[PDB]
Symmetry: D2
Subunit: 233 residues, 4 copies
């Protein structure tokens, strides 16, 4: 069970973000859905509303500080508080081994996957501090825990997400903010293992909700693999 | 709904983390077999479950004894017909010195309960779960399974070993419907720990200072992690060592 | 022992980079020293030459693709090939917890510590491919293995170095290119004395201890060692 | 590059242990070769002596406290001190997945691989303390860092080696004793002498005994004084995934 009232999900227009927004709402939480994709983001808000939940869509490019600042202000204006943040927007666009990549790809992946998470947390934390605490979950990857051949920039970016996650967890541990990362392997989304199958968006959402749950109060600074056994070998 | 399995086995269920997790399973609607050397504490866990409206039974078992563990798993099927979830949580922590100051009796005792006990339990749980087409196992490791434990080197070795058993079994049985995970608690406030720091408050001050959160963990927090690892929507989660540690391993 | 002929050290004007440049040269390797700090970089080369070794300084801002390209080609122009690369240039400039940092600090740290390593590797690898091999060592940090309070951007950047390292190690494992990261804790350099008992050993590390770890990772008998993050930390990560 | 005078190598009669004993001796260190196998052990000593080095053989079952104590005493008896210890004796004997294993296998693997390392360190440490320091390397495995299907007891045992290593490293850090683990993947030992195991390494081959020996010597080297409590994978990329 979740007793906080408001969650923010970035990248909530599709895939893991949409599923996790829906899961928060089904648990009784008011959800701000943030994304570049306004069509999909309103699609997520409408699915929540048709199921009996509360949700608003706010368009935001997480690479832009002013828009992320406005997004967290929008959370406060819409619902008065922010208890949970799922910083999940990310991209994966590489086509080759490290020597065959280009600087445009590097810049784009790092901007969304690292700067986006950093900016989001940078603006979420003061609002959570004002309320006496909160819980943040960042989407890393099994590529944040080991090699990702032909996705070396992506792996660098998801490693970096774990570094931000652990550092913020320690910095704000005594201030009521928990910070964790979920580390999916291959998940059946549009961006698309010892168990012999790929994972499902509902399985990532369930892990995010565990990390945000009332009885996860002692869980902070971890990178939770949801990976069908991939990192165990 | 979150756990659709019918039957859980908790070893070390007479006290502490095991007692609380047995209660958490029962509160979720699961019938619980409580296994322990401590008959009094074990029947006490069962009584608390029953008074709360759940179902449980106690089966005495020394997890270091192969014949007793085999009979314990047989007793689960006799009592409730199957075994969906197993929490292999019995363990001891008895060292008093640095590595060169420990003794072979301590080594043998710690390794027997903490490693052989987990191995025996899995050895007899897995065939039952194979026959059912699936099951989930959670083993109690520790933050000492993930890093040094000064003045507890044998304990650390034993909890590292639990993670090795966990990951190996997770890969071996992944395609047979069995998931195997480990929970890695830091210091948890059990009834025994509380008695200890009531007599010596420095133990509470020191233990809280070991964790970035500035407190020790709660038995209900370990229980909730175990139930997550057993939950229906944790079907893609296997072979992990989940720290529940107030940030301790993030440092 | 090291059978390769040519090493490149970025951030070689000072500290860990200077000591590792000197160590390569002591092992008989010709060294290209690269840094923004020309006076320090020429100082490293002067010290190597004064001890009987061979080295040259090439000024390079590792955040700039064209400068890194010219630097790597300059290695081949000076000495004919490039067998070893120590991608060690880095900065540490944060002054607050995550929510107190600023975007300029983020951009600067990520540019040197992540883009610099990525650019260096992407232009070192083609030469090593043509050679049938090489050894790359990237300077990560214990901050790439765990939290670094009040240095969250730095920790993100050094985590990213490990991701680059492991990914390239797998990509090129069958092409003879080993890629590893050394992970120092606090080392007694100007980066440390600028910032002004956390280490179980009771002291901070020495630059020659990092250099020795780099040289092990580059050594002929390290041919089965790739994709690792080697902590040189007085025990810090073992807790 | 190694200023210590005396190294002890357990499991020194064959394979990684023989190779590391030879490497120590080639670096000018005096070597105590320790093993159950007296014939292979003296063979290691003979190879060292043929190359101009200094070694002796001492028989020891590392599962027996009295023999391990006598082994360390024997190091001091032969050479006066003990600077380096490579606790490398180990076995790998399982035949099936976890539920198909047996208790005799469990007991044997844990006794050599865990108790043997524990006993060795327990008796090495006081001698090193009295000298003002020393360096210990324990042989773990990639199976100490992840799953080993059909070798679950072995994986448990090598995980345990890493736990002993890290704990002792922190306990004795300020007393000058460094404690590290080397973590080999598949190594071409005379027992190994197939193509399937080679292919599961990203490098595409199995490792050489000389590559493990060189990692042990780095961990014992004079300029490894800030390296302690680590598990060093020598694995052709296996653990980088
Ligand atoms: N197999 C997988 O899908 C997989 C595996 C590992 C990690 N991940 C990570 O999971 C997270 C979600 O992945 P997904 O599979 O649901 O991807 P997805 O393709 O379904 O969409 C992710 C969302 O992020 C949005 N987005 C992208 N850039 C944005 C930006 N600058 N600002 C705001 N929104 C932006 C997109 O519009 C999209 O709605 C990502 O961070 C991804 O890297 C995914
Ligand atoms: N701070 C903590 O409490 C902490 C921290 C890390 C790990 N752990 C681990 O949590 C698990 C339970 O911890 P706890 O604090 O609740 O301990 P506890 O002493 O309060 O309960 C442990 C139970 O295990 C039983 N037991 C011991 N040996 C047994 C045997 N051979 N056969 C059957 N039962 C046996 C005991 O009778 C006891 O009821 C253990 O594995 C422990 O190592 C605990
Ligand atoms: N000293 C420590 O405690 C410590 C700890 C962990 C990691 N590190 C890392 O070790 C490496 C070396 O640091 P150091 O301790 O020797 O400090 P240092 O500042 O003395 O050396 C860093 C070198 O990198 C150069 N440099 C910076 N930006 C550059 C750029 N864009 N292009 C080219 N050169 C550039 C600098 O001029 C300098 O000479 C860095 O990557 C650092 O992040 C240091
Ligand atoms: N593929 C590999 O070879 C591999 C991989 C990972 C780890 N390891 C580990 O490397 C170490 C050496 O392995 P190896 O491949 O050289 O094996 P090996 O069988 O060739 O040599 C092992 C030596 O240990 C000795 N030994 C066994 N039990 C002993 C005991 N109780 N007391 C004293 N000596 C004993 C043996 O007599 C033998 O000489 C072991 O710890 C092993 O577990 C080996």
């Amino acid at each position: 069970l979740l007793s906080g009232q408001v969650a923010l999900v970035t990248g909530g227009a599709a895939g893991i973000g949409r599923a996790t927004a829906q899961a928060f709402a089904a648990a009784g939480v008011k959800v701000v859905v943030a994304d570049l994709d306004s069509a999909g983001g309103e699609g997520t808000v409408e699915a929540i509303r048709q199921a009996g939940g509360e949700a608003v869509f706010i368009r935001c490019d997480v690479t832009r500080d002013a828009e992320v600042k406005a997004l967290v202000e929008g959370c406060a204006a819409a619902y008065g508080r922010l208890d949970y943040a799922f910083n999940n927007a990310g991209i994966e666009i590489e086509q080759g081994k490290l020597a065959d990549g280009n600087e445009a790809e590097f810049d784009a992946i790092m901007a969304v996957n690292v700067k986006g998470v950093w900016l989001c947390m940078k603006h979420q934390i003061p609002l959570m501090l004002a309320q006496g605490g909160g819980a943040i979950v960042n989407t890393a990857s099994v590529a944040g825990l080991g090699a990702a051949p032909k996705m070396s920039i992506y792996a660098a970016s998801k490693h970096a997400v774990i570094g931000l996650t652990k550092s913020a967890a320690i910095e704000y541990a005594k201030k009521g903010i928990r910070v964790n990362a979920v580390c999916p392997a291959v998940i059946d989304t549009d961006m698309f293992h010892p168990l012999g199958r790929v994972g499902r968006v509902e399985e990532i959402a369930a892990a995010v909700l565990y990390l945000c749950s009332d009885n996860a109060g002692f869980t902070t600074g971890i990178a939770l693999p949801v990976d069908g056994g991939a990192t165990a070998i």
